[PDB]
Amino acid sequence: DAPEKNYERTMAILQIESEKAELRLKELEVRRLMRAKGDGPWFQYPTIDKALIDHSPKATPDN
Amino acid sequence: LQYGPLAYILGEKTTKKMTENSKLITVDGNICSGKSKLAKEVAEKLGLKHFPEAGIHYADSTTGDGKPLPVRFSGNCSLEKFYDDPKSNDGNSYRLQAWLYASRLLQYADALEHLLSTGQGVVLERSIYSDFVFLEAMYRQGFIRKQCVDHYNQVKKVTVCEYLPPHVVIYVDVPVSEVQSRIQKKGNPHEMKITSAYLQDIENVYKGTFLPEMSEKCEVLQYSAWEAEDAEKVVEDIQYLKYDKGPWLDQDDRKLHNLRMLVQDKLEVLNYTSIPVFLPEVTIGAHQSDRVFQEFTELPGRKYRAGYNEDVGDKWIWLK
Amino acid sequence: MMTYIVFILSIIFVMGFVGFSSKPSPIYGGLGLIVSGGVGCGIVLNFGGSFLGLMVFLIYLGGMMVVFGYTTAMATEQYPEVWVSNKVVLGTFITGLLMEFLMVYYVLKDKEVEIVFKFNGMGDWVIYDTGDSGFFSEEAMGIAALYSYGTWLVIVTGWSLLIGVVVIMEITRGN
Amino acid sequence: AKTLLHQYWDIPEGTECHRKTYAATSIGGASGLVVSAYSVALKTPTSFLEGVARTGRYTFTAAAIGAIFGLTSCISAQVREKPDDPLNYLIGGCAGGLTLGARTRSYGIGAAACAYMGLTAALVKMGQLEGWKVFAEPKV
Amino acid sequence: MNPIILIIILMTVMLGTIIVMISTHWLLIWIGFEMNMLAIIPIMMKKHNPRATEASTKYFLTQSTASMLLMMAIIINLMFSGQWTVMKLFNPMASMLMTMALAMKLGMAPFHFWVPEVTQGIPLSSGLILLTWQKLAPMSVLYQILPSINLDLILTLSILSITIGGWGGLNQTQLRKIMAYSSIAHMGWMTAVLLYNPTMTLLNLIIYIIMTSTMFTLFMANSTTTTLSLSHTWNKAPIMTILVLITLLSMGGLPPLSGFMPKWMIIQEMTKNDSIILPTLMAITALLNLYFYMRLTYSTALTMFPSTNNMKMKWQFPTTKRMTLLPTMTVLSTMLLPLTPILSILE
Amino acid sequence: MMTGRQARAPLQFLPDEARSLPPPKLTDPRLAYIGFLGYCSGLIDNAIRRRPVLSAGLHRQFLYITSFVFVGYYLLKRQDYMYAVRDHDMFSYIKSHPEDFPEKDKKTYREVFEEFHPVR
Amino acid sequence: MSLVYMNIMMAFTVSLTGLLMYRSHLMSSLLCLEGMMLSLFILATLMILNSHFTLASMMPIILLVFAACEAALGLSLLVMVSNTYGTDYVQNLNLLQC
Amino acid sequence: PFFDVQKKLGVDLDHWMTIQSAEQPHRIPARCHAFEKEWIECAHGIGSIRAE
Amino acid sequence: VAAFLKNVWAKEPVLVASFAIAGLAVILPTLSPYTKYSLMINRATPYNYPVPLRDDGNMPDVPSHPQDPQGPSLEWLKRL
Numbered sequence A: 001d002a003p004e005k006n007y008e009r010t011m012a013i014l015q016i017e018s019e020k021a022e023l024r025l026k027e028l029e030v031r032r033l034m035r036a037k038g039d040g041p042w043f044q045y046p047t048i049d050k051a052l053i054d055h056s057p058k059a060t061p062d063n
Numbered sequence B: 001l002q003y004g005p006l007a008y009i010l011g012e013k014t015t016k017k018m019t020e021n022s023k024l025i026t027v028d029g030n031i032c033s034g035k036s037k038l039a040k041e042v043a044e045k046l047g048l049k050h051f052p053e054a055g056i057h058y059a060d061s062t063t064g065d066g067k068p069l070p071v072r073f074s075g076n077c078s079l080e081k082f083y084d085d086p087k088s089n090d091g092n093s094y095r096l097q098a099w100l101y102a103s104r105l106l107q108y109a110d111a112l113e114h115l116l117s118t119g120q121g122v123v124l125e126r127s128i129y130s131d132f133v134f135l136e137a138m139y140r141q142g143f144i145r146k147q148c149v150d151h152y153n154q155v156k157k158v159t160v161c162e163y164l165p166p167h168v169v170i171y172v173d174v175p176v177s178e179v180q181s182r183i184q185k186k187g188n189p190h191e192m193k194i195t196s197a198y199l200q201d202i203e204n205v206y207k208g209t210f211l212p213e214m215s216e217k218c219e220v221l222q223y224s225a226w227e228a229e230d231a232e233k234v235v236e237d238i239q240y241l242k243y244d245k246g247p248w249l250d251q252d253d254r255k256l257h258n259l260r261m262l263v264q265d266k267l268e269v270l271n272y273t274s275i276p277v278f279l280p281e282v283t284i285g286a287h288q289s290d291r292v293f294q295e296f297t298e299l300p301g302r303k304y305r306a307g308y309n310e311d312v313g314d315k316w317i318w319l320k
Numbered sequence C: 001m002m003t004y005i006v007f008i009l010s011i012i013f014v015m016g017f018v019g020f021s022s023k024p025s026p027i028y029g030g031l032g033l034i035v036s037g038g039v040g041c042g043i044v045l046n047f048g049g050s051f052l053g054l055m056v057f058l059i060y061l062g063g064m065m066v067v068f069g070y071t072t073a074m075a076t077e078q079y080p081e082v083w084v085s086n087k088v089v090l091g092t093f094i095t096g097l098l099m100e101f102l103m104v105y106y107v108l109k110d111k112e113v114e115i116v117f118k119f120n121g122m123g124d125w126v127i128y129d130t131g132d133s134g135f136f137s138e139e140a141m142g143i144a145a146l147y148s149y150g151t152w153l154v155i156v157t158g159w160s161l162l163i164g165v166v167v168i169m170e171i172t173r174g175n
Numbered sequence D: 001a002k003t004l005l006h007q008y009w010d011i012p013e014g015t016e017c018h019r020k021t022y023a024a025t026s027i028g029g030a031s032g033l034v035v036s037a038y039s040v041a042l043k044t045p046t047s048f049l050e051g052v053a054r055t056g057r058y059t060f061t062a063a064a065i066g067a068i069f070g071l072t073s074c075i076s077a078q079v080r081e082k083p084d085d086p087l088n089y090l091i092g093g094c095a096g097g098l099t100l101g102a103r104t105r106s107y108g109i110g111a112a113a114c115a116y117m118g119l120t121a122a123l124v125k126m127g128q129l130e131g132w133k134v135f136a137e138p139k140v
Numbered sequence E: 001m002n003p004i005i006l007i008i009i010l011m012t013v014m015l016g017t018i019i020v021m022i023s024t025h026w027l028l029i030w031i032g033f034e035m036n037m038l039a040i041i042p043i044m045m046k047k048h049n050p051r052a053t054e055a056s057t058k059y060f061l062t063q064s065t066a067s068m069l070l071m072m073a074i075i076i077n078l079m080f081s082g083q084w085t086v087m088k089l090f091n092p093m094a095s096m097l098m099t100m101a102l103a104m105k106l107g108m109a110p111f112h113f114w115v116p117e118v119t120q121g122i123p124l125s126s127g128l129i130l131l132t133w134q135k136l137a138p139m140s141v142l143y144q145i146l147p148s149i150n151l152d153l154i155l156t157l158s159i160l161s162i163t164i165g166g167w168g169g170l171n172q173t174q175l176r177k178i179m180a181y182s183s184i185a186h187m188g189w190m191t192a193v194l195l196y197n198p199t200m201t202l203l204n205l206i207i208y209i210i211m212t213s214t215m216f217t218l219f220m221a222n223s224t225t226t227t228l229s230l231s232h233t234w235n236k237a238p239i240m241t242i243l244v245l246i247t248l249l250s251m252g253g254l255p256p257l258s259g260f261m262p263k264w265m266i267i268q269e270m271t272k273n274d275s276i277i278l279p280t281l282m283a284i285t286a287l288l289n290l291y292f293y294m295r296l297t298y299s300t301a302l303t304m305f306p307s308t309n310n311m312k313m314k315w316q317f318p319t320t321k322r323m324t325l326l327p328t329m330t331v332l333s334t335m336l337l338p339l340t341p342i343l344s345i346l347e
Numbered sequence F: 001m002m003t004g005r006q007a008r009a010p011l012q013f014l015p016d017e018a019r020s021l022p023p024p025k026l027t028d029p030r031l032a033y034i035g036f037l038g039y040c041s042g043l044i045d046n047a048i049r050r051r052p053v054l055s056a057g058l059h060r061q062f063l064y065i066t067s068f069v070f071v072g073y074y075l076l077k078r079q080d081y082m083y084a085v086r087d088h089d090m091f092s093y094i095k096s097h098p099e100d101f102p103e104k105d106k107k108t109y110r111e112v113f114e115e116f117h118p119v120r
Numbered sequence G: 001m002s003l004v005y006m007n008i009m010m011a012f013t014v015s016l017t018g019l020l021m022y023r024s025h026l027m028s029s030l031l032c033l034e035g036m037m038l039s040l041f042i043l044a045t046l047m048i049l050n051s052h053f054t055l056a057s058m059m060p061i062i063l064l065v066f067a068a069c070e071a072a073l074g075l076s077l078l079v080m081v082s083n084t085y086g087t088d089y090v091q092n093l094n095l096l097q098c
Numbered sequence H: 001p002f003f004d005v006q007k008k009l010g011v012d013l014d015h016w017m018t019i020q021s022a023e024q025p026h027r028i029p030a031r032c033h034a035f036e037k038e039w040i041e042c043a044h045g046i047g048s049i050r051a052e
Numbered sequence I: 001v002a003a004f005l006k007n008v009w010a011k012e013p014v015l016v017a018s019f020a021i022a023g024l025a026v027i028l029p030t031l032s033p034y035t036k037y038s039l040m041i042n043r044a045t046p047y048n049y050p051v052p053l054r055d056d057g058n059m060p061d062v063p064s065h066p067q068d069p070q071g072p073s074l075e076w077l078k079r080l
């Protein structure tokens, strides 16, 4: 293979691997912030649905 | 496969073909009791299927083409050299005894499968309940050791407790002198060397150990030498019996189904025949069994499963 | 002291549990658990649990009669222990009694106690309702709705009882 | 007894000998009572005096381990004038290993206990220095 | 057993585990565990020998104690939360009690004292169901309450299960107690990464179920119960020695086999959270499991132990046993590592 | 981890948004590896039942190959879907929070002073 | 919390330790399991009748049912111990030690 | 693995005994009905970590 | 079906009466017109209070008084 061939192939490999490394570091930091806060689409542990609540007038009014 | 739990669920109940003719019969006796023909007579008046006596080569006759295999593949022992040399060092005696018990267990499995699948009774010769008595003669003449008897009783304890005793067991009273006279008139050059106390102890363990336990779990019909020669005598004395003894009565479709599922797996039948109890008469080593097994691979039709052999001319292997 | 009536019935409840928890013999175990179950429907019935306390009375009476039949049939020795035959029964029996009256003495002195949770020492007359329930006891309507809302609960409970019968017939077959 | 490990580690090294030795002895005694409870549980003593003699034996064994461990650690940290140094705990763990060997009446157990407990105490000092967490919080 | 009754009992076991898996209510979780126990008792008692009665007695006592602790945790959640959603528990006392209940249902150490006895007493298929299908329901309940599970308790139970299940398998020549202490070690492996990333816990669960089903299916296909009865396999069926070799080297965690897949991923999810000591000790303790796996491969495949005479008859019969999914389980138990990123289907 | 995302579409293997993604090729090397797993399952199934391993059951080996390819194709589609949802949620979260992720001043090495450590 | 919850949890712990420490007799531990179910019944029913959450008032009934729906199982698992052995001691159940 | 069959098939197996504010027999209120309604509508959708 | 019915009516007649009563109790509430009257009696029984509504202005079937003609009637219950 040519030296230009191997050289520019090496540069494409380095671009792809540096992008994957920066995105893995972003992946770690995003998981850290979402487990710390819980504001993102991940780590939404389930709570009670608010559609189950009976909104009709009940028997006694003290409720 | 042919039978399983699905066919039992889909209506094949084993008491749809359990009639009064379903009588598993076994004719016991000494070496030359005139009984080996008599079983055929009991086979040819009651309309039953005769199994011959399981020698070394019973499993050789069941699977494959049925020709007699060489002795180094099956048993690796001898009966003639047992008769010439009962007190050998290499242990022809217990090796031949254990191989005969394995062959008779396969014979009894085939008998129960034919009986529980075809509705036709099977006439055996010297079934597995009448095998250990021969071991006792080989213990009463000093042919084997105590550890071989312990090994055989462990094997028979773990193999016979899952079966049933037969319906009718025929026993033949021939005294020792008439057995010896028929041996001498046979002219068999190896059979003549059998000692007399061996045969007397065969008769003693017949009368004192076999029949005091089988008479309560099957039905005895004890015949002498002269009355075991008429066929219709023994046939009709089977034909008018009142069957209450034995564990054949408390058997429904479920228990006979579990027996039939145990029987039709022949490797599960023969699973604990060769238990790993290290005994010098039966333990065949690594390279010897390796050489004999790689020669068994080269036997014609024996390399693959029973419909996957081009050397015997099997068709459609590439669609099986 | 009379306002502590659910407390007093619950002291009898714990005393019955000490009585059959030292395991003297299942005859006297049946006695102690009949006493504890019979005051269980004195504890829970002073809340409004008429039906739902009578059930834990009745089902446990059937249970202790069957338990009697088995401990008379299979679980019987020659000298059954009353409570005082073995020393190791009576020691932990007296231990349970003095430890229960120890925490009684600690809860009627301080009116607060904490074994791991925190418990008031005033009687449980304070925690009731000041309202009416109309022409129905509310727990009777709740167990009446076992057939209206609770469809899946009825299905799985009937299937569990069915296969419990089948399981027990497959176990006590012997072969 | 997590608070026992607190009031062991809530005292600076090379300052107070007898209180640290008492805290290490108490931690050793708690470990010995755990081993004593499982020993009278999983293997039945043929007498109650058999069981309490085994309980006292295991209790004094682990208490002597903790005592000579913390004592040698504190004395070496004082007399070397290096408080945050794992060689002090290394010598303390080896002294506890020879303690366990003298209580089990065997030399090779004592030498192996010297070596492996010295490695263990070195790991404890380094995990106390760099903040190594064994039961670490899930955070990412 | 009547095969209709056996099919109804197996459907009831599956129904109990499904009722644990699909229900949002704590009482239905408890009813699912009750149904699962009640319908797995006759699977342990299919052959009616006193060893099975001892095994079923010990199993029923342990699972009944666990069910009592589970219902007390449920009632304490009802106290401190006033509701019934299967979600995080609203009390650390209730979380501790439910963790104890699920740990007794899994047989995690030091509640592991029933798994080798019960696994030895019962037949091979019942042991397979006990070691695979009974590890689906309490791991489901542990999956659904992980924001309330205390960290130190579940890590202590996990690493204690790993160490004790590593040591317990070294002194057993019986195959089923080997698989039982392997089960204790692998449940420790699963629950150690539960609070960190539970998708890897589900991955470890599924890979362990595939490997354990491969091992018990080989044990049923050769009808072997001990190491010494497995020793004659090269004379009976030589390809089965290759299969038990590759599966026993898979379960220890040797690359490039699939059992290196969960373990390494567990370390991949424990060094993320600044915990380097604990997966190191787990990786060291995996060598004990791998050691008695190497012992079983030395006995079976890599050498040739001496056989006996009557094997010469068993040469003449093919295995007519229903070897259900055995090549599929073999291939998915040894050659799965290049598809390590398949774990995202469990997210 | 992502259990809040897959709670509005429960028990859906591939959602409606999963079709927006390019599917794996029919010459996918991962699916070809699963086809090799099917070929090995066919060979093991002919080996454990003492059949001629390369000749017996052409339909049997071909159905093993077809079955593993048919399972593995949908498994690879769910794999691609879940990693795509992971990157989509990551990038939308990074875009939604600018104050959590500073853009560094990407210096050059003529200002950054590294400590040299010679080998001698 | 209130006073009666102390004694019901105390009865739970007493029946727990009675179950969790044997006396070489298995029927007496079946009784301790049924006692633990009694304590669970009373505690859940006190909580439900206190909160006036009536719809789970069917919950103790179901609870009590599954009590005997395992305890009768133990009875079927008792006689299979006591048909093998003349007694039902727990030291007859040590053949799974090898 | 929370296989949510009840939301998949649309069936309603045990979403009625779950809370004290659900549909009751003859509209019997609970003594913490208003507080549990406020806590459920306060903590719906915002997840456990923010809801605690 | 008649011959086996006579046979089981000879052998086990209590079981025949049991299965007959059970089968009729299963099938017969789907062949009777009174079941709608059962449901309407059960839902026309006012346990709670008939909670009034705020008059926003336009409810053409809601009364202002019990003796107003609009609303559900129960004269069918008194006739039947």
Ligand SMILES: CCCCCCCCCCCCCCCCCC(=O)OC[C@H](COP(=O)(O)OCCN)OC(=O)CCCCCCCCCCCCCCCCC
Pocket: E123, E124, E125, E126, E128, E129, E132, E133, E136, E202, E205, E206, E209, E210, E213, E214, E217, E220, E221, E321, E322, E323, E324, E325, E328, E329, E332, H001
């Ligand atoms: C995180 C949640 C994940 C949920 C995944 C759910 C997947 C399906 C369920 C898997 C769990 C195991 C369930 C089955 C356990 C064993 C059932 C059983 O005992 O079946 C009886 C049968 C008997 O066969 P035989 O050998 O003839 O019997 C001898 C007589 N005793 O057969 C046997 O004993 C042989 C084994 C039968 C089952 C093998 C197949 C399932 C497990 C292996 C993986 C196969 C690959 C495909 C599925 C991958 C996912 C598990």
Ligand SMILES: CCCCCCCCCCCCCCCCCC(=O)OC[C@H](COP(=O)(O)OCCN)OC(=O)CCCCCCCCCCCCCCCCC
Pocket: I008, I012, I015, I016, I018, I019, I020, I022, I023, I024, I026
């Ligand atoms: C359809 C509605 C739902 C039906 C199922 C639910 C019924 C609920 C009522 C309670 C029933 C509980 C007991 C049921 C037991 C049935 C099984 C049985 O007893 O079979 C055996 C019996 C013969 O007795 P044997 O086996 O000889 O006993 C040994 C010595 N006594 O065999 C018999 O006696 C034969 C009994 C079957 C034939 C009865 C036919 C009755 C027909 C009545 C008119 C038609 C009614 C419509 C429904 C017909 C349903 C078949």
Ligand SMILES: Nc1ncnc2c1ncn2[C@@H]1O[C@H](COP(=O)(O)O)[C@@H](O)[C@H]1O
Pocket: B031, B032, B036, B053, B097, B100, B126, B131, B134, B135, B191
């Ligand atoms: N279990 C056994 N042990 C020793 N010899 C046996 C046994 N069973 C059969 N034989 C011999 O088998 C031969 C039977 O041949 P025949 O009676 O002519 O069919 C006799 O020589 C018997 O001694």
